[PDB]
A paper describes a structure:
MRGPRX1, a Mas-related GPCR (MRGPR), is a key receptor for itch perception and targeting MRGPRX1 may have potential to treat both chronic itch and pain. In particular, MRGPRX1, one of the itch receptors in humans, is able to respond to endogenous peptides, such as γ2-melanocyte-stimulating hormone (γ2-MSH), bovine adrenal medulla peptide (BAM) 8-228, and the antimalarial drug chloroquine (CQ), which has an intolerant itch side effect. To provide the structural basis for the ligand recognition and activation mechanism of MRGPRX1, we assembled 3 structures of MRGPRX1-Gi1/Gq in complex with two peptide agonists. All ligands of MRGPRX1 occupied a shallower ligand pocket than those in most class A GPCRs, with a vertical distance ranging from 12.8 Å to 17.9 Å from the conserved “toggle switch” position of G2296.48.
The two structures of BAM8-22-MRGPRX1 in complexes with Gq or Gi1 trimer were determined by single particle cryo-EM at resolutions of 2.7 Å and 3.0 Å, respectively. Importantly, Y21 sat in a hydrophobic pocket constituted by Y993.29, P1003.30, E1574.60, and W1584.61, and R20 formed a salt bridge or hydrogen bond network with E1574.60, D1775.36, and Y993.29. These observations were consistent with the previously identified “RF/RY” motif, which is specific for peptide agonist recognition by MRGPRX1. N-terminal to these two residues, the two hydrophobic residues M15 and Y17 sat in a hydrophobic pocket encompassed by F2366.55, H2547.35, F2507.31, R246ECL3, and L2497.30, and the successive residues W13 and W14 lay along a hydrophobic patch created by L2406.59, W2416.60, I2426.61 and H2436.62 in the BAM8-22-MRGPRX1-Gq complex structure. Consistently, mutational studies indicated that R246ECL3 and L2497.30 are more important for BAM8-22-induced Gq activity than for Gi activity. Compared with that of Gαi, the structure alignment indicated that the α5-helix of Gαq tilted more toward TM6 and ICL3 of MRGPRX1. In particular, the bulky end of the α5-helix of Gαq, including N359G.H5.24, L360G.H5.25, and V361G.H5.26, formed extensive contacts with V1243.54, L1985.57, R2136.32, L2146.33 and T2176.36, which are constituted by both hydrophobic and polar interactions. N-terminal to the bulky end of the α5-helix, Y358G.H5.23 of Gαq formed hydrophobic packing with Y642.42, F612.39, and Y130ICL2 of MRGPRX1. E357G.H5.22 of Gαq not only formed a salt bridge with the R131 ICL2 of MRGPRX1 but also constituted a polar network together with Y358G.H5.23 of Gαq and Y130ICL2 of MRGPRX1. Consistent with these observations, mutations of these residues significantly impaired BAM8-22-induced Gαq activation downstream of MRGPRX1.
Residue numbers in the entry:
A (entry chain E): 1 to 119, 135 to 247
B (entry chain B): 10 to 345
C (entry chain R): 24 to 86, 95 to 160, 173 to 279
D (entry chain L): 10 to 21
E (entry chain G): 9 to 61
F (entry chain A): 4 to 54, 181 to 361
Write the structure that this text describes.
């Protein structure tokens, strides 16, 4: 599984730029794709989504009309064309794969990202503490709150916990508030009451140092949290 | 030479022991219990994706995911609650006769006239289902396969022999060679220590998985046994045959305990399954229908009659909520 | 013309037999395969025939503003479905591989709904429409007749001439019975009603012999369609 | 509209 | 050649310990009675809990 | 009332359904044949010219129609069960070695069993009386006589409808027509109108066998259509 973003660079405001995402090592056609931008020293924010196939395209309100997301499956390449860029569009754009079926784990892989510098019904995700210094071996807990309950009538609580280590792309830790992602040690556990959720790292290690982001997948604006830092 | 008369004497003494065991009959003991009454199940779901006849289906242990195999060469993994098609696996060989969902849910087994048990990984990082392995070594068509673990799978074949395979190595860990006819169905015991296999020789043999030998043999049926299903506690099992009857055998008592037949039923049984409590014995028939028997009283508790062709496969969920029935009409119906 | 009207009763009698027959079909095929294309055409034909026979029965018992439009609409839908059944039979015999393998599995419906729409368009037009509508209609009835008869004739030419040896009396009987029932029981009502609506002919002969007999024949055709096309099959 | 139309003929 | 294997198999099958059919039937009845309440297909559950309705 | 991750699962199911319709087109367009025959029948040569492992698949085309022939090569000497998998198959190509009178009764019993199989009631049999050159050579040599195995041959005469266009010897015509009649007797004796047998006289090296199969399959499809329209 490899997602390599390209394009980006320095763009004068009001210009246009086509970010690309070459996908290898997995069935790209069967995966939905997201563009998720992270402004410098700021948290994650969902940009765009194109479902498996090409139906069900979505955009964040902040980019509707300006950004257009497409994909060429035969070449296994996702595309984000930007029309009239703004200073607020400066960010590292991450390519995220997400396959949706019963028991699946979407947002399970993020590309390395590409830097782009430019010369009210949404669910709000709140994280109690932006920073929590802690020592290895201790059991630490990170908190999240949702303005709207993420517990759906089908019994799923659409809360995702991602870990972004310094200088690295975010990695999925939990995908339905309780399901540990493949390749994630049992150290990480998720729980929640339907509107408040907690990610517990029982035996924190040096590899667990980073920013922990919460995300809601109840409604597609896919709002992230501000990000709770962990440092040692 | 003299071993033939020795076998005759041993068979006679086995029959004598079985008769000594027959101090009563289930029917006599079950007379006092209240009758299940008349059960009415309705078709909650209909699964319409298969191009051709469905020959096998297996429920996942989650009681929601379901794998079905069709002669169109295509395993379909269904979300039973939503009728969503989770996966559509194209098979290398279209003449699939069996399919099994691993208790972990990570794999599906299938196979058929191609004498291979194909193990498909449903949990690849690539996001597509791929052949984990092709267990070869059976010299006949694969009639039934059941996972005992993500690495251990027991299969029955037209070679009149069953085989426990180590999936990692792709080799038959052990072989079971007591049957004299095509083995059509096998059923694992709840504890996975034993399994029963029914063959075209009209006999069902209990097999010790570890030792690799036939503990007991049962021979009530007059015709080929197409379906076999353990009772929930694992101390008894039901067999369905071309004889148009089902039979409940007890391991401990080592003989037939009840026969489930009706004069109006002349077709052979294709599949059998128990309810969670084991009180209902559901059996599919070549008559495009299915009969729900009172396993303890032998009465016909009900009928599931929503299929336009032969009922090939039948399976009750682990939690006992619903029963799936696949058919040659290319559909699968969930009943509740 | 009061005895002659005795038919207004005979037609009513043959109406039910036909209404009951068409209901059976509707059901039976609402649960039957409805897979065999012939059966997505016989189901549509059964619906059209049922509704036409209901209109006819109410008209006979009428002895109102919605009776004629609905009755005609059903009449023409049923006739078009008979023509489509014939023209498919011919196509399934002429191109058996195409019919069994490459034929869209939807054309049944695409065709049944399209013919329903054609009948509805004709009925609405005639409601709105000096009036040559009637002569277009009559032309439409002649087109349905030539389509049905030509398809049946082409099918017979393919089978007979064909260097094949197979029981064929059933084929001849079914084809000729279908064509004859359509030609002498189905078409006459529409043809006479729309033709002699402008071709002046004696009132007595038209109403007594050319109109009531046509009505009874049309009801007979609608009633015999379920037997001719579905029931014979079942009780093969 | 012709004079000889008769009842049933006058469709509407 | 196979006569000896068949005879040995018969002998092994014959020496197994025996259990009365009455006891086996009683055990099956006891299991069904114990798990009767936990059988959705036997006693239909209220439609609220039924995931197929 | 579906979450975002359900709508996407429903879209995945819709894509699978589209792929399944694409597969249905091919499944319908392809005619499936079951090649049965004894070891001496010569069926292997037939399939070779037309062009453990439990079932062998051969593909060929005639007049843009696709044929998938299946030779069940590695199974026990018993078909009561696996033969049930081959219902609705467009036809059973049953190959018989005509030149071997010693096994001709065995081949007739096999053809009976196949023809009278309860699951093959609607399946037509294209009967290839293979190895006609060997049959003609054996009949002309005179060393062996069919009579020895089938006494009725002594009191059998060629029908007036026989058409030996190539100019074969009358004895060879009598023999081959007696064998064809032996098979057609079983064919007619029982199931009539639900399934037809299409006898053919073929040699080991015959280029017309594929054309024979195509014509017989066209007639089988025509018969299915006729039955669908109650014309037969």
């Amino acid at each position: 599984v490899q997602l390599v973003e390209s394009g980006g660079g320095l763009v004068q405001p009001g210009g246009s730029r086509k970010l690309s995402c070459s996908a290898s090592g997995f069935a790209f056609s069967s995966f939905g794709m997201h563009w998720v931008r992270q402004a410098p020293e700021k948290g994650l924010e969902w940009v765009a989504y194109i479902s498996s196939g090409s139906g069900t395209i979505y955009y964040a309100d902040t980019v509707k009309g300006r950004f257009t997301i497409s994909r060429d499956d035969p070449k296994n390449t996702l595309f984000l064309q930007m029309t009239s860029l703004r200073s607020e569009d400066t960010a590292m754009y991450y390519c995220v794969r997400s396959i949706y079926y019963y028991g699946s784990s979407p947002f399970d892989f993020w590309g390395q990202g590409t830097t782009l510098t430019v010369s009210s019904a949404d669910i709000v995700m709140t994280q109690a503490t932006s920073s929590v210094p802690v020592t290895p071996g201790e059991s630490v807990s990170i908190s999240c709150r949702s303005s709207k309950s993420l517990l759906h009538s089908n019994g799923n609580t659409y809360l995702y916990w991602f870990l972004q280590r310094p200088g690295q792309s975010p990695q999925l830790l939990i995908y339905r508030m309780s399901n540990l992602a493949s390749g994630v040690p049992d150290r990480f556990s998720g729980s929640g009451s339907g509107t408040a959720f907690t990610l517990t790292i029982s035996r924190l290690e040096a590899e667990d140092v980073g920013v922990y982001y919460c995300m809601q997948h109840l409604e597609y604006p896919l709002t992230f949290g501000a990000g709770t830092k962990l440092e040692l | 030479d003299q071993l033939r008369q020795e076998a005759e004497q041993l068979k006679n003494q086995i029959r004598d022991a079985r008769k000594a065991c027959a101090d009563a009959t289930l029917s006599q003991i079950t007379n006092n219990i209240d009758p299940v009454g008349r059960i009415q199940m309705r078709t909650r779901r209909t699964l319409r994706g298969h191009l051709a006849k469905i020959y096998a289906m297996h429920w996942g242990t989650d009681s929601r995911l379901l794998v079905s195999a069709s002669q169109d060469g295509k395993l379909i993994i269904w979300d039973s609650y939503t009728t969503n098609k989770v996966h559509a696996i194209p098979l290398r060989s279209s003449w699939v006769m069996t399919c099994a969902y691993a208790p972990s849910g990570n794999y599906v087994a299938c196979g058929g006239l191609d004498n291979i048990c194909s193990i498909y990984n449903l949990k690849t990082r690539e996001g597509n289902v791929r052949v984990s392995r092709e267990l070869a070594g059976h010299t006949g068509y694969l009639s039934c396969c059941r996972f005992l673990d993500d690495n251990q799978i027991v299969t029955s074949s037209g070679d009149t022999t069953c085989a426990l395979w180590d999936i990692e190595t792709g080799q038959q860990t052990t072989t079971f060679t007591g049957h004299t006819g095509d083995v059509m169905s096998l059923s694992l015991a709840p504890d996975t220590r034993l399994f029963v296999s029914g063959a075209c020789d009209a006999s069902a043999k209990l097999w010790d998985v570890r030792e690799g030998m036939c503990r007991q043999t049962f021979t009530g049926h007059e015709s080929d046994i197409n379906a076999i299903c353990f009772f929930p506690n694992g101390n008894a099992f039901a067999t369905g045959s071309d004889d148009a009857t089902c039979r409940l055998f007890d391991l401990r008592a080592d003989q037939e305990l009840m026969t489930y037949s009706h004069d109006n039923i002349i077709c052979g049984i294709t599949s059998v399954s128990f309810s969670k409590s084991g009180r209902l014995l559901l059996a599919g028939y070549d008559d495009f229908n299915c009969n729900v028997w009172d396993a303890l009283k032998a009465d016909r508790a009900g009928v599931l009659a929503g299929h336009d062709n032969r009922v090939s496969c039948l399976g009750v969920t682990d939690d006992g909520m619903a029963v799936a029935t696949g058919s040659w009409d290319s559909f699968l119906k969930i009943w509740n | 013309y009061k005895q002659t009207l005795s038919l207004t009763v005979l037609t009513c009698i043959v109406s039910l037999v036909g209404l009951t027959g068409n209901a059976v079909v509707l059901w039976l095929l609402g649960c039957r395969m409805r897979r065999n294309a012939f059966s997505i055409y016989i189901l549509n034909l059964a619906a059209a025939d049922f509704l036409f026979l209901s209109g006819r029965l109410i008209y006979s018992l009428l002895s109102s503003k919605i009776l004629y439009p609905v009755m005609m609409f059903s009449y023409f839908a049923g006739l078009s479905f008979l023509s489509a059944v014939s023209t498919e039979r011919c196509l399934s015999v002429l191109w058996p591989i195409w019919y069994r393998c490459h034929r869209p599995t939807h054309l049944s419906a695409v065709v049944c709904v399209l013919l329903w729409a054609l009948s509805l368009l004709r009925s609405i037009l005639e409601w709105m429409l000096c009036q040559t509508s009637d002569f277009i209609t009559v032309a439409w009835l002649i087109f349905l007749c030539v389509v049905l008869c030509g398809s049946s004739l082409v099918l017979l030419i393919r089978i007979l001439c064909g260097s094949r040896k197979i029981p064929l009396t059933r084929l001849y009987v079914t084809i000729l019975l279908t064509v004859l029932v359509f030609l002498l029981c189905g078409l006459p009502f529409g043809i006479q009603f729309f033709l002699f609506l402008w071709i002046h002919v004696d009132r007595e002969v038209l109403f007594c012999h050319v109109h009531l007999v046509s009505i009874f024949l049309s009801a007979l055709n609608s009633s015999a369609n379920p037997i001719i096309y579905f029931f014979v099959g079942s009780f093969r | 509209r012709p004079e000889w139309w008769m009842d049933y003929q006058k469709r509407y | 050649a196979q006569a000896r294997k068949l005879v040995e198999q018969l002998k092994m099958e014959a020496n197994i310990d025996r259990i009365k059919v009455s006891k086996a039937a009683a055990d099956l009845m006891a299991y069904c009675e114990a798990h009767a309440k936990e059988d959705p297909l036997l006693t239909p559950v209220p439609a609220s809990e039924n995931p197929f309705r | 009332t579906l979450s975002a991750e359900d709508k996407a699962a429903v879209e995945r199911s819709k894509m699978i359904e589209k792929q399944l319709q694409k597969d249905k087109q091919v499944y319908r367009r392809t005619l499936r044949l079951l090649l049965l025959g004894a070891d001496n029948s010569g069926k292997s040569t037939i399939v070779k010219q037309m062009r453990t492992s439990g079932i062998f698949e051969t593909k060929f085309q005639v007049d843009k129609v696709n044929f998938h022939m299946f030779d069940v090569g590695a199974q026990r000497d018993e078909r009561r069960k696996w033969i049930q998998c081959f219902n609705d198959v467009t036809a059973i190509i049953f190959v018989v070695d005509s030149s071997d009178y010693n096994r001709l009764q065995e081949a007739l019993n096999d053809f009976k069993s196949i023809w009278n199989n309860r699951w093959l009631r609607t399946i037509s049999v294209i009967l290839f009386l293979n190895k006609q050159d060997l049959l003609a050579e054996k009949v002309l040599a005179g060393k062996s006589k069919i009579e020895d195995y089938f006494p009725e041959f002594a009191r059998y005469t060629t029908p007036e409808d026989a058409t030996p266009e190539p100019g074969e010897d009358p004895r060879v015509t009598r023999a081959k027509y007696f064998i064809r009649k032996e098979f057609v007797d079983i064919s007619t004796a029982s199931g009539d109108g639900r399934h037809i047998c299409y006898p053919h006289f073929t040699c080991s090296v015959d280029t017309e066998n594929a054309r024979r199969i195509f014509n017989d399959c066209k007639d089988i499809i025509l018969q299915m259509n006729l039955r669908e329209y109650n014309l037969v």
